[PDB]
């Protein structure tokens, strides 16, 4: 294939052919970048019309998932064509190529988010989503020596990079556990009930994309937290979903009235 990936000790090296689509037409080297950060290439081999990128495993907006037995670093190559003779039209489409690096691994808590299939049985690929599909996200916290816990999601925020404070961004979950995405429009976004374990929290989010973004990707950064497995939920520690059918907020556990501050849009402790 036109993309070689070398997963080395503390860096990855990606080599891309400029005849990227197999048509013979060579793309411009400068139209290729690495990761959401758009890092420029490190070198060019003119004889083979290749372009190489080299970066640390944590640079350029890569994203690491920690599984029980493996570490997976995920990034991408962007092709963003230069403007046509007249910028009102487009003769060549953009592109995005997923890049992956697996490494075997070698009491503190380890949190993780996983993208699951619609039946929640197994994990699923990060590709192939279309507007209309549903993201099934599973939040969990490792099973330590220590006491049983209960997991909560304070907030999730989508953006075009791993930095949620960047523009544009959109808040899926906010106000300490309020799933605000399911409040508006015709979305079916909600937390799933009941939980599989108290230390696991599932939710479904209707897929979306950012206006003006021609790369068509999204990152989601969540803030997870835990409390004692038997502590009463409160306006600071909760998982609330909105239901349009009944026009009400409903917690996954706890008293109905805990979600009141969701509608007001402020669940501060003050």
């Amino acid at each position: 294939t036109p993309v070689a990936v070398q997963c080395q000790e503390a860096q990855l090296v990606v080599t891309v052919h400029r005849d990227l689509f197999g048509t013979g037409r060579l793309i411009n080297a400068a139209d290729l970048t690495l990761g959401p950060a758009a890092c420029k290439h490190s070198s060019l081999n003119a004889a083979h019309n290749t372009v190489t990128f080299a970066a640390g495993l944590h640079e350029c907006g890569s994203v690491v998932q920690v599984t029980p037995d493996t570490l997976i670093y995920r990034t991408l190559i962007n092709y963003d064509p230069s403007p046509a003779s007249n910028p009102v039209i487009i003769r060549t489409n953009p592109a995005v190529i997923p890049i992956e690096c697996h490494y075997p691994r070698r009491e503190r808590l380890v949190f993780s988010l996983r993208l699951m299939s619609d039946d929640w049985s197994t994990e699923r690929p990060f590709t192939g989503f279309q507007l209309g599909d549903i993201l099934n996200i599973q939040a969990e916290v490792s099973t330590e020596n220590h006491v049983p816990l209960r997991l909560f999601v304070d907030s999730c925020v989508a953006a075009l990079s791993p930095d949620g404070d960047s523009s544009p961004h959109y808040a899926i979950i906010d106000f300490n556990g309020c799933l605000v995405d399911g409040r508006v429009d015709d979305t079916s976004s909600a937390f799933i009930t009941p939980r599989p374990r108290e230390d696991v929290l599932r939710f479904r989010i209707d897929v979306f994309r950012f206006a003006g973004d021609n790369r068509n990707l999204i990152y989601i950064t969540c803030h997870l937290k835990v409390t004692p497995a038997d502590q009463g939920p409160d306006p600071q520690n909760k998982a609330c979903s909105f239901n349009k059918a009944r026009n009400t907020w409903v917690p996954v556990e706890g008293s109905r009235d805990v979600c009141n501050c969701c509608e007001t849009g402020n669940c501060e402790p003050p």
Binding site: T75, L115, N216, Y219, I220, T221, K225
Partner: peptide, 14 residues
Amino acid sequence: VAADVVIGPVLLSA
């Protein structure tokens, strides 16, 4: 005890 986890990149295909 809290933490920030990132999931992505999620790619839409058409």
